[PDB]
A paper describes a structure:
The vacuolar sorting receptors (VSRs) are specific to plants and are responsible for sorting and transporting particular proteins from the trans-Golgi network to the vacuole. This process is critically important for various cellular functions, including storing nutrients during seed development. VSRs are type-I transmembrane proteins with ~ 600 amino acids (80 kDa without the N-terminal signaling peptide).
The resolved structure had disordered regions at the C-terminus, where density could not be uniquely traced for proper model building after the first EGF-like domain. At the beginning of the refinement, a clear electron density attached to the sidechain of Asn289 in the central domain was observed and assigned as two N-acetylglucosamine (GlcNAc). The PA and the TRX domains are connected by a 7-residue linker with no significant interaction between them. PDBePISA analysis of the crystallographic intermolecular interaction between the PA and the TRX domains reveals that the interface score is 1.0, indicating that [name] is highly likely to form a trimer in solution. The interaction between the TRX and EGF-like domains is held by multiple H-bond interactions. The two additional EGF-like domains that are tandemly located at the C-terminus are not visible in the crystal structure, indicating their high flexibility. However, our crystal structure shows that the [name] has an extended conformation with significant dynamic flexibility of the EGF-like domains.
Numbering used by the authors:
A (entry chain A), B (entry chain A), C (entry chain A): 21 to 119, 138 to 465
């Protein structure tokens, strides 16, 4: 029963022409936003609408060019759903109510009104004035209890081998659908990372010291971080922790989907081979996306202090499956509705697995079409380089998410990184 | 039983080599266009093909490199379908017939021939001449009784608010599929518009005069046409009426799908804010698309005369649902197969709703793929600006319909409207 | 039971830290490539894992931050599948085994090890050392018995009429999916061509001499090769034979999918109207694709000698259907799993017909998405013109296969054929 004011306006009986608030039951109103104009009829008998309108020889069927009929029902003796159904049978187009099987078959809008408003219409009608109406509504937003819960156990490191390229490859291919699903209000996505604690046997180890932040509490998941690259296993732990804090901070602000733009831009902009697996590189992206560094940095804490890290401790506890899902033990792991996905990690494969969690004709568009696009360049140029003076930008929005790439203007492919400096090349 | 001449040609017994007309039963011929060459065998017994060929020790199975066998059956005593099945069992590749369950399992082409032709083959054969054949056919066109009926109740006005943008947004996204579906012969689409008549109480009203054409018979559906824009509710009624007449005129000429190119080009080219919601603007598009203005203008009539408007009167009568569909009372309303669609107004959502009205493997391509394109630029450059002297055009064909947009040539994005003037810009 | 060495490495008990070979049963390992780290526990009792671990009060459930448990099972008394299931129930994450209904419900990796290795772990453990592990695996390759068999009976000629354009049109639209399906290891595609032998009656005929290679054994399928174009029916027979030999030669080298790049490039580069239906034109493409001309030419043989042509003779024998499929008598004919396809010859239509031959969640990506691309430009520039000195190429990879088209560089559309010469145009 969603309440809006602009929904119910009163086309003139000019003495009471106005915009009133109502309460519309979710039944009888279609998925798409629409508008319904009509006029009000208040029956002299069967005013509860609990007995069948046919029994009284009352009918509401319209002639052509005639306004559809809004029946004024008084509440009592039976539910609104029955009032709406009874009215619908008699030929009503809507129902204005003043102050468990057939439910699917109710298709006329139902609105509750004030007694003070209902009385106005009744007297306006009794004087002889046509009381016309107008009833808008927006397209259906999914109920939050109906949204699919998926979760991803990933690793941010890139200097792995095949196993890390495939992961970052998935994040890039799914980013578009991931964002559309969640911005549309169909999915609760939570990313997770995996860390182990140092056994007492190897506390103050040479190994545990290059692997573990916070005095051994959280250590790098794979015991081969090829320190030859110059980056210890503990550097990975910190970077992952930053990603999780990027998520928490963005989730608290109502925009979790920005994680996808962080971890992909991190992959692009902060490579290990070029010695950019750094705080300063990550913090660059935090400016670009416009995330709160003070909050992210505070979430990360002091990875050198003999203290716990609530986020990293919660992740170690999330890895133990509760209820029916098992413990997460494989990197990566996709979980959809507290059940571990064991299929191919392809967008096509993963999307089918989730769209089965939707009810038919509650299916998001992203399930039925690839003709879609993220809407991220409308905010802050998506964090990519632009040039307001020349109307050019490096921001492009794609079925696979938002991209910062140096634009080709007047045939000239600009050269640069697209997040900070694009410029014209040569001939 | 489709009749074609070029379908049946007679590879030479040179005395009767020629191109004859036939009559092919729809059974035994596949969906795709193909060609079948063989040679004719006329059995001495079981010539009705009503008893089983096996009973007579007659068989038609071929050796390799050998031409497939065309059995010459005489009509009588049983249906063609049985003749074709009997022959098929014995090993026939086709059947030439001279002058309710197994039917699915018939897969060899069946053709009826003249007695004068059948006798020619029989004598040619009796002299000893191989009578070879060739049998072409085109891909299957859907039977018109099998096509899906959808209908859309829309509004052409644009200065509404959110509700009008979403509608015009749908027309633009669906235009490609809308056109492909109908040009392919799978859908009968009819657009509709909604108008109310002025009550006797408010005849000669100040309001009814700015809302209603034809002396009150047809009035603007929403009673807020924000006359501040300078355009009365009656201006909308006329524009909608023009759109419906664009449809009727184009439907009468066998090209209804041009409505989609009209209403989208109207949206683009005739905006209300720029004071282009005008006859002269609309008539511009009628030239571009090459529609008959004399017929469209005659359909619109004299919206100032005390007379009815058959199209607008038929629309007011179409709004009252007949049979099982209800009265259309919401703008917009999509109806598919005389049942009101109540889902999201997305292409993906709407296309699933219609492709369920097709039989499996009668499914149009547009149901199974997004790798498609309208074919509108082959006619008159789709009504967009071109430049024959430079091979450039503003016409582009898209999965979302035909677009007139100023081309980027040698890297130079041309500037203009793409329907009437494109030109080179600056540096 | 796939055997790899790099799959099983032993995170340190430093005295036995190393990379050992194993044998992983296909059960309990997901579709996606992943990695699993844990530590080994060797139970003192129930070491066959044949009785239920619960009966002994043995459990493997982990605390958080704790490494997942690898149970060391001794083989005997029951199958690995039961050992893995029993262990899984008790809370194991994997199983190390030393030296017909519930099977679906087994989800922990199972690996077999050497007795010499199993003993090492046992003694290492008995001294007190944590024996940790690491277990990688790649994404699942489909078993070759599970792949779909489709076959196409086509014609290479182009100067037909509508029937030949539609065929070449299909080859071009399907080439992308055709290649992806087969390179991914989901389909065995074999192309076929159709030829008839000259009847003794018309041996040494005027007609049979312009139609048939190898002294009449193999003749052009349609008896109208419009010799007005200058190309006899026997020229078509030879060109088709070359295509089939291109397939055989490429199939023998493990790259059959190159046929698709041959027959489409033949269509583009060797047209009949421009008198390019020549050996020298075809041999040009054989260089481009880098096919072995010596093998292809030897497969074609001497189409003028009184001899058989094994490939053309095998094709005439393949046309006679064996088992349940009929004789192929229509051009074109698509067969999927020894059953003749009778639907529309559209990619969308054809792909549904094949993806039904896959088990759910064994579905290739190409079945669930159009966001795909051939990977052909990584090899030899796909056979298209390039210019290494300028980083430009004519090779582009598409959902519809690999394309050689002259690139547009700095806004300048280059002009040429894209296989051999691209060059800058004018202004
Ligand atoms: C991310 O934000 C959401 C909502 O802001 C959080 O979800 C809530 O979690 C609490 C604690 O379990 C529940 O009682 C609420 O019902 C949840 N609200 C929802 C699901 O809308 C979520 O915990 C946040 N943090 C994450 C996901 O790590
Ligand atoms: C648009 O054109 C079609 C065909 O030209 C019209 O459809 C015919 O309508 C008459 C009257 O109801 C029927 O008897 C015919 O069977 C219809 N032919 C068909 C469906 O092929 C249609 O009425 C025209 N006008 C519209 C749709 O407004
Ligand atoms: C193309 O190559 C494949 C494999 O190299 C050939 O398939 C083999 O054919 C033999 C003979 O029938 C079988 O015994 C094998 O089991 C097949 N191997 C497979 C299917 O992997 C095939 O014959 C070759 N030639 C074609 C398809 O014309």
């Amino acid at each position: 029963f969603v309440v809006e004011k602009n929904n119910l306006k009163v086309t003139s009986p000019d003495s009471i022409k106005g915009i009133y608030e109502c309460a519309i039951g979710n039944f009888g109103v279609p998925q798409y936003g629409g508008t319904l104009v009509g006029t009000v009829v208040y029956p002299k008998s069967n005013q509860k609408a609990c007995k069948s309108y046919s029994d009284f020889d009352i009918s509401f069927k319209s002639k052509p060019g005639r306004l559809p009929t809004f029946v004024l029902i008084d509440r009592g003796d039976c539910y609104f759903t029955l009032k709406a159904w009874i009215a619908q049978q008699a030929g009503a187009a809507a129902i204005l109510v003043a102050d468990a099987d057939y439910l699917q078959n109710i298709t006329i809008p139902s609105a509750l009104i004030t007694k003070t408003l209902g009385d106005s219409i009744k007297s306006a009608l009794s004087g002889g004035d046509m009381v016309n109406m107008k009833l808008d509504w927006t397209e259906s937003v999914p109920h939050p209890d109906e949204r699919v819960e998926y979760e991803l156990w990933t690793n941010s490191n890139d200097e792995c081998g095949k196993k890390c390229d495939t992961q970052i490859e998935f994040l890039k291919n799914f980013k578009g659908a991931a964002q559309i699903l969640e911005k549309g209000g169909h999915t609760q996505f939570t990313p997770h990372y995996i860390t182990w604690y140092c056994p007492e046997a190897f506390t103050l180890s040479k190994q545990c010291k290059s692997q573990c932040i916070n005095h051994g509490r959280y250590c790098a998941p794979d015991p081969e971080q090829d320190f030859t690259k110059g980056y210890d296993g503990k550097d990975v732990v910190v970077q992952n922790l930053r990603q999780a804090c990027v998520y928490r901070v963005m989730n608290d602000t109502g925009k979790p989907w920005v994680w996808w733009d962080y971890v992909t831009d991190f992959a692009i902009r902060c490579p290990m081979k070029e010695k950019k697996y750094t705080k300063e590189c990550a913090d660059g992206i935090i400016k670009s996306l416009g995330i709160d560094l003070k909050k992210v940095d505070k979430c990360i804490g002091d990875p050198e202090a003999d203290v716990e890290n609530p986020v990293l401790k919660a992740e170690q506890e999330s890895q133990i499956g509760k209820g029916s899902r098992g413990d997460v033990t494989i990197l990566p792991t996709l979980v959809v509705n507290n059940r571990q996905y064991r299929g191919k990690l392809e967008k096509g494969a993963v999307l089918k697995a989730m769209c089965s969690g939707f009810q038919e004709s509650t299916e998001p568009a992203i399930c039925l079409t690839e003709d879609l696009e993220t809407n991220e360049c409308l905010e802050n140029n998506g964090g990519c380089w632009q040039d307001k003076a020349a109307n050019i930008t490096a921001c492009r929005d794609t079925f696979r998410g938002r991209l910062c790439e140096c634009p080709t203007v007047q045939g000239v492919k600009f050269v640069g990184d697209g997040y900070t400096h694009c410029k014209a090349s040569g001939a």
